[PDB]
């Protein structure tokens, strides 16, 4: 993971969002998790670097996604063999953001974007429902 | 429903949707309570057959009407259902509809709908607003619902008006008995009532059952942030409690447990929750981080504390606490006051004397800091219960400390002037006698006493200048490590300021017709004698106030950057006073090592002075000619064009086939030579560049004028021959200033594409497509025949208003700014500006004749040929029939703007963001556009950007009020006609907008000082051209300069002061005459019938 | 009847405070250097009826104040200075020789 | 006055400027309470007297709250005036009831106080 | 000046500042008197120490107003601020010092 050099906060936080990208089971994170909130009590400067620097599009900051991520990830974690340990994690790494104004209202989930394109490429009202079935 | 014939599918479906969702609304019954997600699947399919685009070939409202639905009982499902966003925009389609079928045969709206469906359309909107947790939008919501207790008690929370809702609380009893007590307990906790909050808490112990579980949590609370150690599914505050006695009690299994334990409950109880906006996850966020901030204390406790470990805490404590700098009070106030009750802890659980003052020392500075924290958000309890806390564990003997200046500032806070004056006076007594201010640590304290001693009696006008001048700011700039440059900075600008006023006092008095009354009273013999000597001592005094004004402001800019913005009144002054000998020597010696950039901002002005007329070592131009060759020397990409334009003012005869500006040529030749001597391929690209526009730009194009496609450039033309220019970065560019001289990793122009494209326009400017070194195509406007110089310095003026809307927290978090495009003036004559993608003329996306929105939807109103042709018959008749015919004109064209967010964005989330960053640009620009003036606002002028929504204001030439002198003037402010107030939504002008409109007016009143210095800056400026000629407005509608200057600047002074019709307003007052005054049809029927009031 | 006399005073004010203002005489300087000469005769004679009509609402309307009390008898003043500075109207002259002539006497006094 | 004050603590033990103060106070006149000096504004009482000659009663209640080196009596006394003049009779008729755990020492102004907001308040069972 | 004195001044000011039409109007109606003659001349000037009057009395009342107003020299004022600002240039031994000495300034 390490090549090429070492990783700055933010390009921890993108690892992670690359990582929760994959589908699995939320306690499969718990580890990863850890980590994250070793970076977020290390790198304070840092996120001050990025929240100056997604001001101008505040919209897809990526403290506001990481955020929403962290949220969707312990809401899939309800009633399974990982609750209470992954809610544990999870605010462990969400107090270490705490209340910053995201400048932004709405939440947008992070939706995929294969699909939009792949629907994109279809016409016909027809195929786009063959695409999506299938 | 695509295969649908006679509408039986339409109707069949359309009428057991309807009941339905009816039966959704119930609340037994003999349907209702229905499962929650039925009611989802129910809206999934509403929204997703909004979408789709029916045969009839409509519109988007067609497309939102496939079923016959009764979209307000739609809107409260999805309310219930916390679909937020979709329920406000079902409610705005629904009033859409309703009033579509009114014309066809909110207060009435709302009555209306709670006659038939029973649903108020405004309680509905009010929920949805406060579920949005926006704001400003929860002002749009007014009417008969607005008396109700309860409803005034929220908007007394909103405001933190906590004396107030303490006595509505205690006042009304109908409210239901756990509201009352939780809303008591808040109120009185944030009024700072500890005791009296204790007290009651014990009295509510009597006659009192069994408690509700907000009635322990608020007394948990009460007991953690009071430090009652003594009384005792487990809620936040009572694990706080539990966590922090277990860490008083060294039992750290249970205090991890108990933390454990919170950080599981909370996360659950978010997660459970529907996560829509958020302003919901920021309560979650600050007990998060309480959580985290205690656990991390409780592991450094846990083992032996050294002083390094409580410093690096506090070190962390206090990057968070900046980060954490936009965040609301009610988010930051509750971890400031777990920090203190965990420092309160540590002091009295140390019993070790040497790190006993180390706690001590750190509680201090973390009580300042909450101090200032709760003063900057105009909160007057809490200061002083912090202050008393330092006094109780900082019982001082010297009597000098830092916490005792925040002391003072707080009384000042309190409007409680003789105790803060009294306190400083003394520490300042106390200081002189202590020590020569010799100390390094008393050095900071004694400088920041005097000088805010000097500035609170320089407000109060409780002493005279001289002594204010000699005792306490004069003494501050001499009794003074980024500290130390702060306070010295901060010193000179107090000293620099006071100067500034007196020699403005010196100035004003001797302009004033009072002195001139007098002096021809005794032109009417030892008279004569004493008026020349009062004469000369004035004049004396004059040039003293002057010279040290002067000198304390270059010695600011020299001390930081905090204050870059004051350069400007600095030139007015080396402007103003050239043959003034002294102040040539201070810009020379002192002046020459400001750092350049600082000087960028006001570049357009100072390359206009330049001359050849007063020369020598101290001679003002030779002086200005270093200067300027110095700033073109560091920043050459910020610089080198404006030069060249001064230079290749008269080009445009030259590529074809007065003595100041021969002077100022002549001096713009020079700097270009020494530039060219030290750079010169960089000097000779840039002028061929500049041939090759400005010969695009004299191409005669009239036989292109239909063809929209694109036309290829002539092979003749140079611009099609310059290839990979390497250090010619691209002038339509916004640059990064560097304050080093580097300037490695810029975009630079590779190639120009071999085809232009045409938008029309009378002069009929040329869009041509620059491809940079990376792989990204700048869209340019080559404009021939026309002066840009204009534009150019009225963007630096946007720019000016961004930087002070930035700096202010408060239109800071609203993201309020003013949309601006990059100028380069090439002559008196051409230019090239940066064509911003994405951007269409709100009239031609309105009232187009061929598919405007005017003709789309609303096919049945009239024309806007025959709105233009009515109202133009009727020009030259009286001002009564104007208005009739306005009205009539007005009754048949309704506003249809609110659509254009409607079809652009799906996303109902999407589309409210964007229609909020559109009222918020709308509000900006207008009330920008006001205090600059601004006018000729037409329907061309003002484009709309499809991606962002939000506006960009073009064509700036008219300004200050200048539109009011054209025949038929312009008798509004700004434009807000019905079709922009129909862009904001359901509330209009009564909700964002009003708010928004305060916040800037505020941002505009409180730096009225830099706005009038570079007003004044521009203003004089002898290449603007900004007074209206009457050739100009010939064209608009198909010394006197100096006392015109002056009454500019005295209009601009009254509007940023306040002052209409003599009148001093408030900002909520003057913002409501500016709207009234904006939206009143009886001025919109006096103008002219190209600005098309109307639309 | 104050209430009314006051507004009317005020829009009077300022109609008069714009016709006296830096601004009226600059656009008429700027005009001065043909449509456009009709049209500002014709705001010209707009502006003047609307401030002979708000002069004479408040003339009337303090008149009448004056004869319902005498919580306000120091506002004569306000009317006087009206009547002393619009001799020629010819509006306020019948107006003031009507109703203004059953204004109790002592009123006029600290004018006198 | 402030040296002149000084100067005759030293030496005859009296300050003139708190023995102006408390003339002025004594005779009553309200603008006169201004101009006695400003060696004596910290202290608490003094800013609590100047809040309750301006009826600034919120500033009286967050003061009175907070300094706890007052004699109690009179904090108690000061606290119920304050409530009361706020309107806030049903706080007040809390606080008393809550008072009551600590009434081991009665002087008689904290009984007076309770008879009045029994009988502003209509309580009729305060007795 | 510290005691009544200071009290008393900002009592009669805020009273002046909450009547300033009255007062307004009532030196109006004073000033345009043909028989008043309040203005200066030379003469009276040499007497004291051993059209343009339309313009002086637009001048005379806009000065009036602006005092009125609390608005001195350009920045508008409370009316304790206006009364200090009234006391420290009345009790200025700077500005005394150039008075008349007819005036006594020194009594
Ligand atoms: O001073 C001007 C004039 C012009 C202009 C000139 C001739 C015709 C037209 C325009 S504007 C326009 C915008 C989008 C679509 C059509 C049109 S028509 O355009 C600009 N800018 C600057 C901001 O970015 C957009 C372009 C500034
Ligand atoms: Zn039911």
């Given at each position: 993971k390490y090549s090429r050099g070492p990783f700055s906060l933010l390009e921890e936080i993108n690892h992670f969002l690359s990582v929760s990208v994959y589908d699995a089971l939320p306690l499969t994170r718990l580890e990863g998790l850890k980590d994250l909130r070793r970076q977020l009590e290390l790198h304070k400067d840092q996120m001050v670097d990025i929240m100056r620097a997604s001001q101008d599009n505040p919209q897809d900051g990526i403290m506001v996604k990481l955020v929403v991520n962290l949220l969707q990830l312990s809401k899939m974690?309800?009633?399974?063999?990982g609750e209470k340990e992954v809610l544990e994690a999870v605010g462990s790494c969400l107090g270490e953001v705490g209340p910053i104004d995201f400048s932004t209202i709405a939440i947008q989930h992070s939706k995929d974007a294969s699909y939009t394109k792949a629907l994109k490429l279809f016409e016909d009202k027809e195929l786009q429902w063959t695409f999506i079935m299938l | 429903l695509l295969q649908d014939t006679n509408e039986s599918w339409r109707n069949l479906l359309s009428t057991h949707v309807q009941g339905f969702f009816t039966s959704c609304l119930r609340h037994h019954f003999f349907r209702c309570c229905l499962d929650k997600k039925s009611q989802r699947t129910m809206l999934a399919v509403v929204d997703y057959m909004r979408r789709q685009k029916r045969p009839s070939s409509g519109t988007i409202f067609n497309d939102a009407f496939w079923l016959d639905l009764n979209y307000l009982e739609v809107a409260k499902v999805a309310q219930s259902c916390a679909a937020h966003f979709t329920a406000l925009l079902y409610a705005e389609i629904y009033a859409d509809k309703k009033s579509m079928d009114d014309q066809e045969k909110i207060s009435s709206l709302s009555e209306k709908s709670k006659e038939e469906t029973g649903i108020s359309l405004q309680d509905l909107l009010l929920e949805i607003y406060r579920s949005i947790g926006e704001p400003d939008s929860l002002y749009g919501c007014g009417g008969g619902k607005m008396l109700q207790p309860i409803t005034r008690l929220r908007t007394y929370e909103h405001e933190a008006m906590w004396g107030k809702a303490l006595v509505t609380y205690d006042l009304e009893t109908a409210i239901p008995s756990s509201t009352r007590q939780a809303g008591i307990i808040q109120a009185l906790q944030n009024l700072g009532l500890c005791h009296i909050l204790s007290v009651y808490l014990k009295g509510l112990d009597y006659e009192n059952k069994d408690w509700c579980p907000e009635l322990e949590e608020l007394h948990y609370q009460a007991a953690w942030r009071n430090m009652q150690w003594d009384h005792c599914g487990t809620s936040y505050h009572e694990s706080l409690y539990n966590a922090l006695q277990s860490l008083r009690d060294r039992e750290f299994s249970t205090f991890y447990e108990s933390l454990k334990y919170a950080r599981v409950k909370e996360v659950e109880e978010m997660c459970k929750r529907s996560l829509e906006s958020v302003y919901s996850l920021y309560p979650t966020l600050s007990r998060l981080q309480a959580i985290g901030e205690l656990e991390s204390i409780g592991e450094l406790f846990s083992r032996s504390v050294t002083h390094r470990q409580l410093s690096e805490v506090y070190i962390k404590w206090q990057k968070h606490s900046q980060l954490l700098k936009d965040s609301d009070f009610s988010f930051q106030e509750p971890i400031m006051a777990l920090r203190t009750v965990i420092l309160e802890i540590l002091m009295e659980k140390e019993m070790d004397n040497s790190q006993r003052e180390c706690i001590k020392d750190i509680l201090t500075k973390h009580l300042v800091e909450l101090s200032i924290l709760a003063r900057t958000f105009k909160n007057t309890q809490l200061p002083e219960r912090a202050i008393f806390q330092i006094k109780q564990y900082n019982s001082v003997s010297c009597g000098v400390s830092e916490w005792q200046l925040e002391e003072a500032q707080v009384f000042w806070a309190k409007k409680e002037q003789s105790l803060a004056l009294s306190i400083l006076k003394q520490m300042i007594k106390k200081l002189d006698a202590s020590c020569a201010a010799n100390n390094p640590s008393l050095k900071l304290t004694y400088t920041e006493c005097l000088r805010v001693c000097g500035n609170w009696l320089a407000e109060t006008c409780l002493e005279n200048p001289a002594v204010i001048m000699q005792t306490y700011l004069e003494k501050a700039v001499e009794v003074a490590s980024d500290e130390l440059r702060n306070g010295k900075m901060k010193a000179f600008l107090s000293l620099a300021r006071f100067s500034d006023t007196q020699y403005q006092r010196i100035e004003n008095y001797m302009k004033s017709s009072e002195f001139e009354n007098k002096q021809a009273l005794l032109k009417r013999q030892r008279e004569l004698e004493l008026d020349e000597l009062a004469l000369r001592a004035l004049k004396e005094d004059r040039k003293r106030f002057l010279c040290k004004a002067v000198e304390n402001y270059i010695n600011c800019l020299l001390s930081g950057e905090e204050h870059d913005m004051w350069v400007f009144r600095l030139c007015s002054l080396w402007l103003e006073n050239s043959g003034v000998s002294e102040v040539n020597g201070m810009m020379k010696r002192d002046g020459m090592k400001i750092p350049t950039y600082k000087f960028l901002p006001l570049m357009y002005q100072l390359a206009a002075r330049m001359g050849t007329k007063m020369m020598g070592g101290l001679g003002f131009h030779e002086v200005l000619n270093n200067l300027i060759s110095r700033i073109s020397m560091d920043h050459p990409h910020h610089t080198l064009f404006i030069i060249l334009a001064l230079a290749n003012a008269n080009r445009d005869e030259f590529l074809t086939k007065s003595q100041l500006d021969e002077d100022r040529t002549e001096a713009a030749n020079r700097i270009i030579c020494t530039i060219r001597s030290r750079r010169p391929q960089m000097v000779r690209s840039v002028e061929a560049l500049c041939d090759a526009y400005i010969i695009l730009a004299n191409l005669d194009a009239t036989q292109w004028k239909t063809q929209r496609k694109g036309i290829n450039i002539p092979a003749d033309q140079p611009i099609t021959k310059l290839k990979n220019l390497e250090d010619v970065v691209v002038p339509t560019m916004e640059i990064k200033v560097d304050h080093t001289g580097e300037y490695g990793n810029l975009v630079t122009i590779q190639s120009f594409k071999a085809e232009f494209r045409l938008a029309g326009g009378v002069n009929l400017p040329k869009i041509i497509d620059c491809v940079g070194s990376d792989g990204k195509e700048r869209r340019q406007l080559v404009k021939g025949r026309d002066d840009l110089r204009q534009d150019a310095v009225m963007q630096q003026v946007f720019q000016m208003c961004n930087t002070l809307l930035q700096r202010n927290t408060e239109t800071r978090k609203r993201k309020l700014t003013i949309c601006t495009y990059k100028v380069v003036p090439l002559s008196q004559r051409s230019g090239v500006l940066e064509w911003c993608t994405g951007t269409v003329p709100i009239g031609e996306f309105l009232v187009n004749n061929e598919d405007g929105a005017h003709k789309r939807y609303r096919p049945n109103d009239f024309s806007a040929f025959q709105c233009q042709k009515k109202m133009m018959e009727v020009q030259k008749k009286s001002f009564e029939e104007k208005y009739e015919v306005f009205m009539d004109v007005c009754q048949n064209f309704q506003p249809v703007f609110r659509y254009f967010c409607m079809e652009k964005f799906l996303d109902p989330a999407i589309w409210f963001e964007k229609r909020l960053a559109y009222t918020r640009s709308v509000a900006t620009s207008s009330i920008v556009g006001y205090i600059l003036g601004l006018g000729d606002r037409h329907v061309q002028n003002i484009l709309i950007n499809e991606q962002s929504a939000e506006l960009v204001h073009i064509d700036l030439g008219v300004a200050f009020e200048q539109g009011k002198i054209l025949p038929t003037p312009e008798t509004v402010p700004f434009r807000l006609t019905r079709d922009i107030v129909d862009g904001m939504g359901i509330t209009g002008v009564e909700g964002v907008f009003r708010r928004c409109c305060e916040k800037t007016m505020e941002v505009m009143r409180n730096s009225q000082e830099t706005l009038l210095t570079i007003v004044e800056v521009l203003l004089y400026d002898?290449?603007?051209?900004w007074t209206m000629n009457p050739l100009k407005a010939l064209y608009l509608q198909q010394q006197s300069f100096n006392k015109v200057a002056e009454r500019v600047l005295m209009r601009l002074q009254e509007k940023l002061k306040g002052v209409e019709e003599g009148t001093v307003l408030s900002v909520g007052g003057q913002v409501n005459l500016l709207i009234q005054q904006a939206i009143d049809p009886k001025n919109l029927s006096r103008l002219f019938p190209g600005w098309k009031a109307w639309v």
């Amino acid at each position: 993971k390490y090549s090429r050099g070492p990783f700055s906060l933010l390009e921890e936080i993108n690892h992670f969002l690359s990582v929760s990208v994959y589908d699995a089971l939320p306690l499969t994170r718990l580890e990863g998790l850890k980590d994250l909130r070793r970076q977020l009590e290390l790198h304070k400067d840092q996120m001050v670097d990025i929240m100056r620097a997604s001001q101008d599009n505040p919209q897809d900051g990526i403290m506001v996604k990481l955020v929403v991520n962290l949220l969707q990830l312990s809401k899939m974690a309800i009633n399974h063999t990982g609750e209470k340990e992954v809610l544990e994690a999870v605010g462990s790494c969400l107090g270490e953001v705490g209340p910053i104004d995201f400048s932004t209202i709405a939440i947008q989930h992070s939706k995929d974007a294969s699909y939009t394109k792949a629907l994109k490429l279809f016409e016909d009202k027809e195929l786009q429902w063959t695409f999506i079935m299938l | 429903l695509l295969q649908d014939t006679n509408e039986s599918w339409r109707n069949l479906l359309s009428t057991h949707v309807q009941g339905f969702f009816t039966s959704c609304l119930r609340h037994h019954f003999f349907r209702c309570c229905l499962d929650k997600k039925s009611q989802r699947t129910m809206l999934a399919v509403v929204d997703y057959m909004r979408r789709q685009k029916r045969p009839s070939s409509g519109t988007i409202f067609n497309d939102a009407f496939w079923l016959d639905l009764n979209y307000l009982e739609v809107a409260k499902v999805a309310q219930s259902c916390a679909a937020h966003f979709t329920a406000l925009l079902y409610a705005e389609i629904y009033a859409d509809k309703k009033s579509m079928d009114d014309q066809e045969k909110i207060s009435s709206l709302s009555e209306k709908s709670k006659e038939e469906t029973g649903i108020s359309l405004q309680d509905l909107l009010l929920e949805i607003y406060r579920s949005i947790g926006e704001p400003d939008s929860l002002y749009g919501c007014g009417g008969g619902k607005m008396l109700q207790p309860i409803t005034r008690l929220r908007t007394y929370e909103h405001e933190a008006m906590w004396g107030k809702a303490l006595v509505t609380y205690d006042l009304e009893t109908a409210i239901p008995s756990s509201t009352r007590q939780a809303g008591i307990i808040q109120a009185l906790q944030n009024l700072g009532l500890c005791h009296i909050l204790s007290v009651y808490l014990k009295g509510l112990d009597y006659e009192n059952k069994d408690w509700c579980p907000e009635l322990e949590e608020l007394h948990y609370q009460a007991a953690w942030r009071n430090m009652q150690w003594d009384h005792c599914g487990t809620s936040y505050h009572e694990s706080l409690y539990n966590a922090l006695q277990s860490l008083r009690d060294r039992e750290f299994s249970t205090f991890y447990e108990s933390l454990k334990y919170a950080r599981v409950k909370e996360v659950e109880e978010m997660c459970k929750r529907s996560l829509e906006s958020v302003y919901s996850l920021y309560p979650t966020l600050s007990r998060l981080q309480a959580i985290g901030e205690l656990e991390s204390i409780g592991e450094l406790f846990s083992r032996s504390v050294t002083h390094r470990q409580l410093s690096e805490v506090y070190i962390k404590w206090q990057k968070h606490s900046q980060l954490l700098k936009d965040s609301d009070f009610s988010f930051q106030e509750p971890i400031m006051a777990l920090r203190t009750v965990i420092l309160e802890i540590l002091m009295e659980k140390e019993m070790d004397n040497s790190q006993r003052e180390c706690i001590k020392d750190i509680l201090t500075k973390h009580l300042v800091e909450l101090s200032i924290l709760a003063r900057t958000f105009k909160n007057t309890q809490l200061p002083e219960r912090a202050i008393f806390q330092i006094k109780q564990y900082n019982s001082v003997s010297c009597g000098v400390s830092e916490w005792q200046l925040e002391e003072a500032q707080v009384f000042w806070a309190k409007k409680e002037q003789s105790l803060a004056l009294s306190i400083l006076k003394q520490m300042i007594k106390k200081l002189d006698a202590s020590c020569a201010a010799n100390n390094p640590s008393l050095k900071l304290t004694y400088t920041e006493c005097l000088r805010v001693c000097g500035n609170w009696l320089a407000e109060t006008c409780l002493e005279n200048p001289a002594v204010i001048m000699q005792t306490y700011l004069e003494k501050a700039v001499e009794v003074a490590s980024d500290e130390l440059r702060n306070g010295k900075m901060k010193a000179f600008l107090s000293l620099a300021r006071f100067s500034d006023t007196q020699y403005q006092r010196i100035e004003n008095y001797m302009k004033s017709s009072e002195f001139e009354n007098k002096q021809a009273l005794l032109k009417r013999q030892r008279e004569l004698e004493l008026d020349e000597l009062a004469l000369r001592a004035l004049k004396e005094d004059r040039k003293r106030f002057l010279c040290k004004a002067v000198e304390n402001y270059i010695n600011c800019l020299l001390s930081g950057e905090e204050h870059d913005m004051w350069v400007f009144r600095l030139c007015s002054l080396w402007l103003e006073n050239s043959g003034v000998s002294e102040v040539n020597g201070m810009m020379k010696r002192d002046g020459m090592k400001i750092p350049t950039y600082k000087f960028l901002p006001l570049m357009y002005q100072l390359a206009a002075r330049m001359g050849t007329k007063m020369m020598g070592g101290l001679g003002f131009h030779e002086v200005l000619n270093n200067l300027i060759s110095r700033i073109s020397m560091d920043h050459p990409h910020h610089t080198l064009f404006i030069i060249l334009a001064l230079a290749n003012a008269n080009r445009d005869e030259f590529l074809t086939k007065s003595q100041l500006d021969e002077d100022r040529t002549e001096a713009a030749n020079r700097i270009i030579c020494t530039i060219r001597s030290r750079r010169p391929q960089m000097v000779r690209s840039v002028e061929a560049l500049c041939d090759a526009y400005i010969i695009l730009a004299n191409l005669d194009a009239t036989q292109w004028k239909t063809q929209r496609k694109g036309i290829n450039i002539p092979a003749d033309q140079p611009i099609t021959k310059l290839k990979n220019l390497e250090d010619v970065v691209v002038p339509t560019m916004e640059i990064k200033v560097d304050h080093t001289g580097e300037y490695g990793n810029l975009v630079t122009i590779q190639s120009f594409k071999a085809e232009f494209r045409l938008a029309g326009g009378v002069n009929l400017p040329k869009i041509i497509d620059c491809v940079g070194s990376d792989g990204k195509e700048r869209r340019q406007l080559v404009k021939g025949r026309d002066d840009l110089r204009q534009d150019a310095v009225m963007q630096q003026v946007f720019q000016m208003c961004n930087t002070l809307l930035q700096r202010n927290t408060e239109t800071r978090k609203r993201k309020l700014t003013i949309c601006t495009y990059k100028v380069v003036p090439l002559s008196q004559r051409s230019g090239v500006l940066e064509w911003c993608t994405g951007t269409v003329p709100i009239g031609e996306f309105l009232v187009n004749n061929e598919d405007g929105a005017h003709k789309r939807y609303r096919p049945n109103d009239f024309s806007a040929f025959q709105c233009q042709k009515k109202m133009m018959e009727v020009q030259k008749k009286s001002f009564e029939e104007k208005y009739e015919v306005f009205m009539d004109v007005c009754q048949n064209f309704q506003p249809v703007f609110r659509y254009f967010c409607m079809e652009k964005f799906l996303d109902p989330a999407i589309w409210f963001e964007k229609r909020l960053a559109y009222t918020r640009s709308v509000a900006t620009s207008s009330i920008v556009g006001y205090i600059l003036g601004l006018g000729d606002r037409h329907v061309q002028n003002i484009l709309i950007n499809e991606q962002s929504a939000e506006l960009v204001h073009i064509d700036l030439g008219v300004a200050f009020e200048q539109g009011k002198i054209l025949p038929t003037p312009e008798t509004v402010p700004f434009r807000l006609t019905r079709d922009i107030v129909d862009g904001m939504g359901i509330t209009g002008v009564e909700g964002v907008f009003r708010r928004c409109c305060e916040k800037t007016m505020e941002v505009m009143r409180n730096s009225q000082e830099t706005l009038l210095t570079i007003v004044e800056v521009l203003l004089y400026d002898p290449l603007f051209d900004w007074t209206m000629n009457p050739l100009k407005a010939l064209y608009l509608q198909q010394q006197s300069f100096n006392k015109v200057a002056e009454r500019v600047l005295m209009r601009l002074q009254e509007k940023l002061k306040g002052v209409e019709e003599g009148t001093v307003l408030s900002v909520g007052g003057q913002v409501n005459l500016l709207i009234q005054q904006a939206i009143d049809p009886k001025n919109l029927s006096r103008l002219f019938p190209g600005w098309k009031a109307w639309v």
